[PDB]
Each structure stands twice: as structure tokens, then as C-alpha cells.
């Protein structure tokens, strides 16, 4: 088992920024962030595998984001930039035990509790 | 024996290729396990660089033969095995009817308590409007049987089938297939009598996969032997 804590998020407007961050419990594969806006489906925006050597973002997230990851303190970070409402979203940390960044939700063995972001 | 202990149960795997193929070059990552009780692998590849610039399925070849289910009574004419968790050395050509060739070198082996097929694809003189750099295989794989003896000089096994890539035409593009497997231990090894593997595999899609991807499920069972 491992456990994901989040923190960051909240209340923004367009045009605005804003910062998620996410740490485990343990040393971890690949970790990803996802969103889920209200009533849609979960989809992957953004992660490191658990080498480093492979970034991934979305289509929709252009060059607005940057994951940057920490395996000494375990912890994956999320900045956002030029925030439309679109954005508006509970946001997700996830990873896995092994190291591949897939992006399907259902390769993921860890989940955190879910972050607001609201533009 | 110890060889054969190590895959009485499900095994993880990991695959790591690096290709170029008339200069196009790019990387693929799998994972998935096996199970040689069922002679059952289960992987799913994403292409990590972009888009792969070949057809998923002329790699299927290239992307771990110590999963093949062997009777009782081939037990002694199981190679692949016997060379682990040392590993042996895979290396192919494979020769695309009327267009170009891959020249591949893998390492199967033990890392921990994960099977890894670590591979370098070279591909060369592909007509860049063929079947392949022109993505004309349909996204399917037939069933083969790959043909295995005995080379003791090399302390190893020679390997040869071909591949009938099925094309969005109505045609068949043959791949032909020389395989040469050898011991990276130098503890002993099998050396089989000659024999087959009956090998079945299928494609799929994961439909939340955003990367390029592939799904593959492969069955293999020896035969050849009374
Ligand atoms: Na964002
Ligand atoms: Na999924
Ligand atoms: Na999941
Ligand atoms: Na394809
Ligand atoms: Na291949
Ligand atoms: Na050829
Ligand atoms: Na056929």
C-alpha cells in the first residue's frame, strides 16, 4: 500500500496560475496527475514515469503545464498557467508501483483523495 | 531444475526497445507478465517518444520465448529456461518480402524477480511508400510456428519462421525471420532436439490509452515431440 497527500489547488480566475502538489507515503513508479471536471470522465493531464527519462501531457494542455518530480522526498508537483474555466476541475494525483507512464486510470495502483480547482 | 522453477507462476515483465529505421528513430516501453504454465503474455507497449513510425505489428516478433508452455515430455528440449536467470542473447534479421530488413539484439533476463526483454532494432532500405513505412498492415496477427534446433558450436538454438502480415488490400506481406538464441551464463544449458512452438497472438487497443500503443496477448505451446 501507499498514500498520496495533496495539497495546492483551490479558487482562481482566467488568465490566472495555480499550483497542485503531491506526496507518497514511499519510493514510487511512474506518477501522473489526472482531472475529473463535474460529471465527466476522469482523463490523464500530465506525468513523469518513474525513470524520469519519459514526459507526457495531455493534447489540451498544450505548453501551459510542468510536472517536475522528486523521488528523494517522493512528491510529484503540478504548475498550471494561463487557466481558462475549462480548467475547472477535481484534480488527482496517481501512481504506480512500476515505472512505465501509461495514462489510463486503470494502470494505476495509487490514488490520492482529490484536489478542487476552480477558475 | 532451477531454470524452470523460476516460471511456475506468473512473472512480471518489462520490455525496453530502441529502434531506428532509415534514420526515423524511437523508443517503446512495455510491461505486462507471463505465465509459461498457460504458455500466456500479456503487454501493453506505449511508444514514448511519439509516434512510432512502423506498423505495431512488425515489431510483435521483437517485443520472451521462456513463457512457452512445454509438455512434460519436451521438458528437456526447453532452452529458453534453461539459460535463466543468467538470460540468453536474442538476435534476428528479418527479412520483408520486396522491402526492407530489421536487425535486432535483446538481452531476456532476470533483474530482480522481473523478466526483461531490453532490445536495439535496426531497420534499413525501407521504400518509404511500402507496406510498412506506409502503414498499409492492418492492425491484426496470425497464428505461426516457429521452428527451433539445436547449434551446439554456439551452445545455442537457431530459430526460423515466417510471418504472414495481413494488408489492408487483400494481400499478404511475408516477414521471413532468422533467429539465433545464446547463454549470457555460462552454466549449462538445454540443446534441443528439433521441435516447434505453436504461437497464436492477438491486437487490441485500450481505449483511455491517449499514447501510441499497443495491447498483446500471445499463446505458445511446444510440440514436434512424441
Ligand atoms: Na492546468
Ligand atoms: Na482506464
Ligand atoms: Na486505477
Ligand atoms: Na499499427
Ligand atoms: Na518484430
Ligand atoms: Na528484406
Ligand atoms: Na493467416
Known amino acids: ?119 | 531444475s532451477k531454470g524452470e522453477e523460476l516460471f511456475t507462476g506468473v512473472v512480471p515483465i518489462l520490455v525496453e526497445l530502441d529502434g531506428d529505421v532509415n534514420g526515423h528513430k524511437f523508443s517503446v516501453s512495455g510491461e505486462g507478465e507471463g505465465d509459461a504454465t498457460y504458455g500466456k503474455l500479456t503487454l501493453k507497449f506505449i511508444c514514448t517518444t511519439g509516434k512510432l513510425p512502423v506498423p505495431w505489428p512488425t515489431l510483435v516478433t521483437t517485443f520472451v520465448q521462456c513463457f512457452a508452455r512445454y509438455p512434460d515430455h519436451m521438458k528437456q528440449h526447453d532452452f529458453f529456461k534453461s539459460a535463466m536467470p543468467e538470460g540468453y542473447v536474442q538476435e534476428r534479421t528479418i527479412f520483408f518480402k520486396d522491402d526492407g530488413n530489421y536487425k535486432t539484439r535483446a538481452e531476456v533476463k532476470f533483474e530482480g524477480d522481473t523478466l526483461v526483454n531490453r532490445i536495439e532494432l535496426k531497420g534499413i532500405d525501407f521504400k518509404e511508400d511500402g507496406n510498412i513505412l506506409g502503414h498499409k498492415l492492418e492492425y491484426n496477427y496470425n497464428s505461426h510456428n516457429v521452428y527451433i534446433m539445436a547449434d551446439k558450436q554456439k551452445n545455442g538454438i537457431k530459430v526460423n519462421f515466417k510471418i504472414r502480415h495481413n494488408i489492408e488490400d487483400g494481400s499478404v506481406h511475408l516477414a521471413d525471420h532468422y533467429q539465433q538464441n545464446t547463454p549470457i551464463g555460462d552454466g549449462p544449458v538445454l540443446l534441443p532436439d528439433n521441435h516447434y512452438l505453436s504461437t497464436q497472438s492477438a491486437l487490441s487497443k485500450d481505449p483511455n490509452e491517449k499514447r501510441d500503443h499497443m495491447v498483446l496477448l500471445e499463446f505458445v505451446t511446444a510440440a514436434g515431440i512424441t
Open chain 1, 1 to 119: 500500500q501507499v498514500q498520496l497527500v495533496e495539497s495546492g489547488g483551490g479558487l482562481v480566475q482566467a488568465g490566472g496560475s495555480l499550483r497542485l502538489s503531491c506526496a507518497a507515503s514511499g519510493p514510487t513508479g511512474a506518477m501522473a496527475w489526472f482531472r475529473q471536471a463535474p460529471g465527466m470522465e476522469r482523463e490523464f493531464v500530465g506525468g513523469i514515469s518513474g525513470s524520469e527519462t519519459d514526459t507526457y501531457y495531455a493534447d489540451f494542455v498544450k505548453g501551459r503545464l510542468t510536472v517536475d518530480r522528486d523521488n528523494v522526498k517522493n512528491t510529484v508537483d503540478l504548475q498550471m498557467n494561463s487557466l481558462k474555466p475549462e480548467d475547472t476541475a477535481v484534480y488527482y494525483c496517481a501512481a504506480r508501483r512500476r515505472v512505465t507512464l501509461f495514462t489510463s486510470r486503470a494502470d494505476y495502483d495509487f490514488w490520492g483523495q482529490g484536489t478542487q480547482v476552480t477558475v
